[PDB]
Amino acid sequence: SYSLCTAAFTFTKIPAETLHGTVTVEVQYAGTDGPCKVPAQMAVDMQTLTPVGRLITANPVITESTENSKMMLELDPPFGDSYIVIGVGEKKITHHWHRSG
Amino acid sequence: IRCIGVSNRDFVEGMSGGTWVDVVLEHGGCVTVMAQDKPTVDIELVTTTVSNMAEVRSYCYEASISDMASDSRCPTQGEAYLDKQSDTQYVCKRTLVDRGWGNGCGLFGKGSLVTCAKFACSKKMTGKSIQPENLEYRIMLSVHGSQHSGDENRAKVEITPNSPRAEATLGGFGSLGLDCEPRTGLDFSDLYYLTMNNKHWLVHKEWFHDIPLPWHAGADTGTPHWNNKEALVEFKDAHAKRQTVVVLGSQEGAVHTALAGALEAEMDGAKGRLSSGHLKCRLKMDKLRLKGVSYSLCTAAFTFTKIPAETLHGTVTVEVQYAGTDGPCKVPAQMAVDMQTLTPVGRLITANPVITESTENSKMMLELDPPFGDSYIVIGVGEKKITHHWHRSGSTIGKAFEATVRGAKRMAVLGDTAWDFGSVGGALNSLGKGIHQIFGAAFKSLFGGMSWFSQILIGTLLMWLGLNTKNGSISLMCLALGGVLIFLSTAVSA
Amino acid sequence: EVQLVESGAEVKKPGASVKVSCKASGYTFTSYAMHWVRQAPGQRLEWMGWINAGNGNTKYSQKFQDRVTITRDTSASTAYMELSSLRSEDTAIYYCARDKVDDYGDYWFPTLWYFDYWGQGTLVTVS
Amino acid sequence: SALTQPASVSGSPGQSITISCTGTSSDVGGFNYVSWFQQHPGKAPKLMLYDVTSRPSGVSSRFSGSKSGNTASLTISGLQAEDEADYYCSSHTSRGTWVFGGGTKLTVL
Amino acid sequence: AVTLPSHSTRKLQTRSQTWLESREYTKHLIRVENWIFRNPGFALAAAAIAWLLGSSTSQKVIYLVMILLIAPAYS
């Protein structure tokens, strides 16, 4: 449950692309609350919107307490090129991933 | 403003369908955007910064060689040695040589000699590599405004694949939600950033590995162990004896002439700053207010200063200064056909024109898009309203043919990205990117790699096969391919 | 908790050989590790280490590629760095720290963290 | 080698400091390996980094790491004053050995 | 000595002129035309060995222009 957990997000590292169809992301979550939960989406449309593709990691979650706890998340973008979305309804950093094939 | 008269500019206008659009904005052009409502905005690529690079190889384009040793064994005992071999820095080749009698060597039978020389190179070609992430697109966008030629109007947006969404403030105008894509544009990670003497340009991961010169192996400093080294020397033995070795001097010009297919990149520094560039941005209006619609319109004389002019795309700027009234007032822009009835005819570019007021400064400069015939451009209000004759002089089917040719060049450069260039809501567009996506990909797959004469030639070979024999099928598709190649050389002719 | 301590304050004549002990306490000397980082006061930390306590392997800074040799023994769970032919220069403090070996027992690429703990320190001075 | 790190610095409490460590492509640039080691004079050094941006759990969330090109920046804000521990930057080189920067004497005024 | 890389292997297509794109179209044509200006006898014989193999008055034409194109650069 953990509500959805809301606050800023800043990509720690420029995310990655594995050779086995994956994108790995680390996030600070800019320091709000405890053991909350933050979503993420693969959005072909707009900044966010509809979710396509699949999260290889499930129930992505923040660990605990002060400032930044990094949530690394194995994500498979759709066969096109999307925009990783970090989950704040409004304030969120994003990307563009161009998975091949 | 910011756009007018680049000769590459392109107009894009959405038909409601919400605020969607999305135009591939491309360095060297300025894409202008107009809507039913909304102001009209001009966006052009500006500069594409590649922030962080890492070194792969170096090579060398100018050799120099040091001392030359010899070490010649006679016919019996064969191979020679020359202790100065077995280094990184000495190159060697064995050349069985003439030497029977007269001079040592109590038999005929040749006898190897090892002659070597020390290879220390003068300059480095230092290829650098980039990966799509951390590159930076900086797009600047300006709205039409009173400004004539001297800023709530032009905004500065920098779009990093670490921040592909961008939203730019325009006080009293709107956000102009920019969803760009900083990845798919140029096929980076293929391109390497190549440095000859104090110049820079991009070339492919195929061309840069295949140059036959000494390797530096991406090494750092010290006394770099040079791979190869043989391709740049010249071991020749005069007649049968006395092997000699020559330097085969600077090839700087040779790579330059061999490099014809690259684009050159402007600068180096902490950051490579290059040019050209290709972005597909999803342009999102959402928040744009016109800010003028509430104003009064002002009755005063208007006096042209710069006489109006015809831009290459046909739009006509006109600059109007006027005294005599105050308030930030609208000005009537409608162009007309008869001086009698106004009956506005022809689309206006500037949407709502306004004035900054202040004193008798004026200066708007709105710009217009006259009809294909004769037209009076009338900026004015009551009886005394100042006019200008125009005569656009382009035909309509001329304009359609124009936009088609232009369409064919955008389609030739951007490949599969032509489709979705001014996308909107129709699906048949997605079918386009799909259909031209597979023909494009498989097209570049079997061909690719085809020079100018290669594609012109094979173009006509396919068109002579175009009308040579048999069925109306294969002959038809061969004629089609030939059409695409010939057409692709013809395009980009200038 | 995790405890490392070693031989206390010690002095050697120029040309002698120091033997420092690192007694690992409070954790599992399993996916072991240890290092040796020399420090005296007022200069740069040099790392002349070794990296493998499972197999007894070692890697040394060329700096001291052949001077120090290292013995590792689980019965005492102890790693012994021994610096031979020390000089006036070497007067310093030798900390032993760990960076956990990978699962396989072979240590090639470290943990992303290195030193989560440090030895107590041993000041060694040369006459 | 010998990571370039500047000798020493200071400022008002709460004020941002940034100590930037400059390496080469051999180590700091082509790796995520970095460490900043708070060393209390007289005592044993400790960890205050771990893979750049992140921190060991017992770290004052004060601290922040960053990297650009060849750089290592430990940027501290909201200073509690009693946090001058000679800061040494250290990283894993490509050759498989570790190097510790010149160290930064931290000056608390 | 082997590098002719970058025009044939692969090109950058953009709304920019490419390196020496001003020079190329014609640094692919003149050398061949030049080389045929010298020693046209090779055009004589090449015309022969084309003209006697295939005999469609078309397929040989292809053999004429092809054999004339392969060895100005003789490769």
XYZ file of C-alpha atoms in Angstrom, chain B residues 8 191 201 203-204 206-207 212 258-264 276 449-453 461 492-493, chain E residues 2-16 18-20 24-25 28-29 62 69:
48
model
C 14.180 26.656 -45.133
C 29.122 8.978 -34.947
C 33.805 16.620 -37.505
C 32.196 10.177 -38.794
C 30.763 6.636 -38.533
C 32.613 1.985 -39.552
C 34.804 4.551 -41.214
C 44.632 2.049 -42.014
C 38.984 10.461 -48.030
C 36.559 12.037 -45.580
C 34.083 13.544 -48.066
C 31.016 12.088 -46.394
C 31.364 13.625 -42.942
C 29.662 16.703 -41.581
C 32.077 19.066 -39.876
C 23.008 20.372 -38.192
C 26.666 2.356 -48.343
C 26.140 3.743 -51.832
C 28.069 6.767 -53.058
C 26.779 9.448 -55.411
C 27.692 7.712 -58.670
C 20.592 0.233 -64.236
C 20.002 17.353 -52.055
C 21.404 18.470 -55.403
C 44.325 1.780 -48.502
C 42.022 4.611 -47.355
C 39.274 5.912 -49.595
C 36.812 5.787 -46.611
C 33.683 8.005 -45.913
C 31.824 8.749 -49.256
C 30.908 5.193 -50.311
C 31.046 3.373 -46.971
C 28.471 5.678 -45.377
C 27.101 9.206 -45.455
C 25.580 11.810 -43.193
C 22.364 13.172 -44.675
C 21.276 16.505 -43.242
C 20.178 19.972 -44.256
C 23.806 21.064 -44.267
C 28.487 17.584 -46.060
C 32.277 17.952 -46.163
C 33.373 18.563 -49.763
C 32.783 14.970 -55.240
C 30.085 14.557 -57.820
C 34.283 10.609 -59.159
C 33.670 11.724 -62.687
C 25.955 -2.949 -69.982
C 33.798 1.844 -65.249
